[PDB]
């Protein structure tokens, strides 16, 4: 690219205003300097998305009194290291390391780590055939190359046509310094599956098993914490 | 040659009447196979149904409110109260209080779809006409209850609107139409014998990448 880019985080502004005119990119909505060679933390990415200046044009906004099947979205508080703060708030709750609520809403002594993540994808039935071996090798390649996740953290892949499952497992103790967190890889993967790459200049996930493209129709993601949630 | 239930595949059908009779899975209630089944009964079917697929831990968290097997009334509507921990729900079964005098109806639904960018051209006129055709033909919703379609590439919105006073006896409810549509978009047709939604616009097959659904009640939530 002729100008500066941030391959791992398009939610940035890049300037040749760095030392010696080098490229520097800063995160939208927080301002944290971003390492454009590794994944940005989910917390900081959520802050960037909430800060995004939407122009609705002729789209309508949901009413403030409208209900959703989700817990709702929000601009999170992140600590200086980019992690979710354990408490998120005028009403408050505790979250785990992927930002998901793990207590009832009240008025948080630790950030409970999410150490196991189950991603369940149903793809559109297709004439192209593939087996577990193919799927396992391909997802491991994509997690290493696209998300920079070490394959030791892909604990398992399961396949019962047309349902793919990926199990990510990662204890804090298993993480070398700078290792990508499964919680961040899962989030980038989730957004890729919804057709929103968070990368800059890497196209879509474009999942193929034998070069044959798969169309994901339904995504479910389950998060298991190191201590059970307290509802 | 056999009995089917075009509007509800979550049934077992047998020639038992005076005549095909189709009973809902997971409740056994007889089903009217000429109109949409209530979302409440379809959720009970879904919950009453793994090989090498793993099940999530009972302690796993999700980014939604959690799926449950609801209580329905003898007309197949959600009972207003769902339950140890109890709460009130609206007519699409969504919780509207914290954990119930009436079943408050959802009278406006916003469906927000983002489609994959595609080479085939189309515009709002094309989308409006096609989505209105599909909601009448596939989802059996009367035309007046689609209030609006909006398009800012690649986002499509459909607004459904159906006030209690404007819903005739026997009309399909917008909440059931929205549920059938939501499941179709996720690649699960609830119909029997009608294939997929297979959305195509000005001749272009479209792939939906992301669905968001907003429900607005005739009485505001009390949280």
């Amino acid at each position, epitope marked *: *690219q*002729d100008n500066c*880019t941030c*391959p791992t985080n398009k939610m940035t502004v890049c300037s040749p205003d760095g030392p010696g005119g080098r490229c520097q990119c800063r995160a939208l909505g927080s301002g944290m300097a971003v390492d454009c*060679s590794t994944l940005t933390s989910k917390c900081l990415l959520l802050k960037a998305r909430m800060s995004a200046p939407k122009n609705a044009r002729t789209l309508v906004r949901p009413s403030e009194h409208a209900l959703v099947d989700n817990d709702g979205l929000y601009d999170p508080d992140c600590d200086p290291e980019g992690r979710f703060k354990a408490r998120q708030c005028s009403v408050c709750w505790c979250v785990n390391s992927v930002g998901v609520r793990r207590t009832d809403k009240g008025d948080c002594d630790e950030l409970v780590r999410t150490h196991h993540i189950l991603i369940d994808l149903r793809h559109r039935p297709t004439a192209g055939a593939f087996n577990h071996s193919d799927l396992d090798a391909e997802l491991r*390649r*994509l997690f*290493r*190359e*696209r998300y*920079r996740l070490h394959p030791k953290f892909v604990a398992a892949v399961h396949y019962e046509q047309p349902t793919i499952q990926i199990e990510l497992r990662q204890q804090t103790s298993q993480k070398a310094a700078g290792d990508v967190d499964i919680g961040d890889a899962a989030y980038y993967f989730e957004r890729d599956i919804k057709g929103e*790459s968070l*990368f*800059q*200049g*890497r*196209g*879509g*996930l*474009d999942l*193929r098993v034998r*070069g*044959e*493209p798969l169309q994901v129709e339904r995504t479910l993601i389950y998060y298991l914490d190191e201590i059970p949630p307290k509802f | 040659d056999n009995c089917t239930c075009p509007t509800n595949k979550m049934t077992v059908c047998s020639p038992d009447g005076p005549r095909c009779q189709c009973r809902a899975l997971g409740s056994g209630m007889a089903v009217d196979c000429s109109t949409l089944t209530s979302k409440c009964l379809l959720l009970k079917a879904r919950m009453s149904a793994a090989r090498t697929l793993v099940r999530p831990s009972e302690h796993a968290l999700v980014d939604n409110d959690g799926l449950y097997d609801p209580d329905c009334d003898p007309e197949g509507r959600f009972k207003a109260r769902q339950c140890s921990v109890c709460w009130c729900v609206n007519s699409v079964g969504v919780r509207r209080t914290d954990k119930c005098d009436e079943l408050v109806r959802t009278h406006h639904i916003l469906i927000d779809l983002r489609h*994959r*960018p*595609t*080479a085939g051209a189309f515009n709002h006129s094309d989308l409006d006409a096609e989505l209105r055709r599909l909601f009448r033909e596939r989802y059996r919703l009367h035309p007046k209850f689609v209030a609006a379609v909006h398009y800012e590439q690649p986002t499509i919105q459909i607004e459904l609107r159906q006030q209690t006073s404007q819903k005739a006896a026997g009309d399909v409810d917008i909440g059931d139409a929205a549920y059938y549509f939501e499941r179709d978009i996720k690649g699960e047709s609830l119909f029997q014998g009608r294939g997929g939604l297979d959305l195509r616009v000005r001749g272009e097959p479209l792939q939906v990448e992301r669905t968001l659904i907003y429900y607005l009640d005739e009485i505001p939530p009390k949280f």
Partner: antibody
Amino acid sequence: QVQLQQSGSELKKPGASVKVSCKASGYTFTNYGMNWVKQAPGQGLKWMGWINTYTGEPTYTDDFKGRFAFSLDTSVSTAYLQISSLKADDTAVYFCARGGFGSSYWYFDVWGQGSLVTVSS
Amino acid sequence: DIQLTQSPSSLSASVGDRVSITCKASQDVSIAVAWYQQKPGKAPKLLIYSASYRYTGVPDRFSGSGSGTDFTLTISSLQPEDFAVYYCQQHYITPLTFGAGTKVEIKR
């Protein structure tokens, strides 16, 4: 019998235009991107850009834009390379090469045989 | 653009020799490096993608390694059909770029 078949050699005067075709057969054309690679006589490979056959959108590079145009006719599974205002340094073999739509598939598994374009007065 | 420094520009080897060709990227490209072989008058053939994955039908003697900035294509035992030009390519980000090529020639 997955194949890309390109059009034949071309000889053009400076200032002229040329259109090179790349016909796909044996696979679903809109499931893959089509990439264009230049190889001047005696030189190495240079990526010119590509066209997303599903969205129809071309992506050019700094060195190949303006008078280079990538287009498609999906009804006959064909991608085209048009070069206008030809100059002698355009003399080269042009390859089309199939790839995917995202970076973990942006390597080229199936290639055309190449089309030689020679520009001379 | 990501510059690839491919070395050596040429090498002479005998049938039976272990041959290694390196590709240095000007910035970290994960494992997204492909290698191609090209003979005279022919299109290039894909050998390796994602730094170490052999493409269908590519013989076992071709292998790839590396991550980050430094990559290596290895021919574990050169065979008579392997004298050719080899190219690396990065597929980390657009624009896609190539190394300048390595000509593998017959030693005598």
